[PDB]
Swiss-Prot record, chain B:
Regions annotated as coiled coil: none
Protein's UniProt keywords contain Transferase: yes
GO molecular function: dinitrosyl-iron complex binding; fatty acid binding; glutathione peroxidase activity; glutathione transferase activity; JUN kinase binding; nitric oxide binding; protein serine/threonine kinase inhibitor activity; S-nitrosoglutathione binding
In-chain residues carrying the UniProt-annotated modification Phosphothreonine: T62
Mutagenesis or variant effect for Y8F: Reduces catalytic activity about 50-fold
Modification sites for N6-succinyllysine: K103, K116
Catalytic activity annotation: RX + glutathione = an S-substituted glutathione + a halide anion + H(+); prostaglandin J2 + glutathione = prostaglandin J2-S-(R)-glutathione; prostaglandin J2 + glutathione = prostaglandin J2-S-(S)-glutathione; prostaglandin A2 + glutathione = prostaglandin A2-S-(S)-glutathione
Residue ranges of every copy of the GST C-terminal domain listed in the record: 83-204
Name of the protein in question: Glutathione S-transferase P
Family: Belongs to the GST superfamily. Pi family.
Modified residues (Phosphotyrosine): Y4, Y199
Listed EC numbers: 2.5.1.18
Enzyme kind, highest EC tier: transferase
Species in which this protein is naturally found: Homo sapiens
Amino acid sequence: PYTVVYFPVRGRCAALRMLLADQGQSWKEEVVTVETWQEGSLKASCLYGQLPKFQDGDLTLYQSNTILRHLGRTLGLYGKDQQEAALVDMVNDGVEDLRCKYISLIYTNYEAGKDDYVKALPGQLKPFETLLSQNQGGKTFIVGDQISFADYNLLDLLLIHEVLAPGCLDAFPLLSAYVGRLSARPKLKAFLASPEYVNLPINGNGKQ
Amino acid sequence: MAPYTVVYFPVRGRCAALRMLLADQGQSWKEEVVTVETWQEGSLKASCLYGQLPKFQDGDLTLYQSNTILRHLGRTLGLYGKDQQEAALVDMVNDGVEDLRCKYISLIYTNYEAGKDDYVKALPGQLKPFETLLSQNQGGKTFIVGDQISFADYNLLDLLLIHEVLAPGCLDAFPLLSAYVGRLSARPKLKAFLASPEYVNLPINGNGKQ
């Protein structure tokens, strides 16, 4: 019922894929190679000229976070009420903010900007540790008592940063335990260990 | 006091859209202004979730992130589409607006002089998506999504307003967006807000560039 149109990398589809997998949803991967993308056709047909492109039945969507929020809304991963929904958005936007800085590093300034990025990393991750500390002692989810699309997005954020800066979660016990706990969920655990995830590079330029 | 409180710097910036939304919806709110000098003191910043503003107060609910505030008000005031599918289209529009706003932000604050020519050159291709969406929704005679206004409309409206200042006549190539701006700006409550000192006497950005 779901189709993900994206390049052969984890990137901005990693979180939504983990969500679909953990939620026991099946989906088709429409892999677009760089060569195919360079042909120009598909790009021209995309709303903002970019991927991922997402299909849910007759509904076609663009924008990674829109897909996340759509799945969150339709699959019930958006908090229990409006207050929690606001909290879920606050976390996701925060994740998006850091991901954008991560993307800038990876794609435009890896060699000269990595040292400074890693130096400031602790200060960028602390907010999430604080949020967990204020919710059920950090024993459940980033918001409320049920998983939300923000959890999958934050999880990915944390996974890629552990690769960029190994041990960056050492000073944050709640985040560390959070990563292990979510990664241990049966279906997600299976996904993370599968070739579909493992044999895909994190980004499109070979940097991580 | 008022249930709504906006904590931000004395600029329109990332609070312009949510303010238009509140004003157009007949809502009142408190403006708690933070001067750069106060911000430099460090206390407030240290207390903010992500170390930045805006900070929004709704009763005892304290929020951060401009788009979280927009979505929150959109949810609470019924400005998020008529159903789940429209809500998704509303998000798609806002995320697009957010993407352009970040580029606009990069130009204004980190590379105005050297990047303006290319930014303006590339502007048309960046605005086209919104004109397209408009053309696919009742000939663009109503809103960006569906037949009722959404929080995305206020965000897109602001985006268009500041780009007309950045590049006068940029909407000449987009009749639907042009009429759209004139139409929404004409809404009684919004029109009054846009002409008021509360809005007019605040600069668009915080570094004097526009």
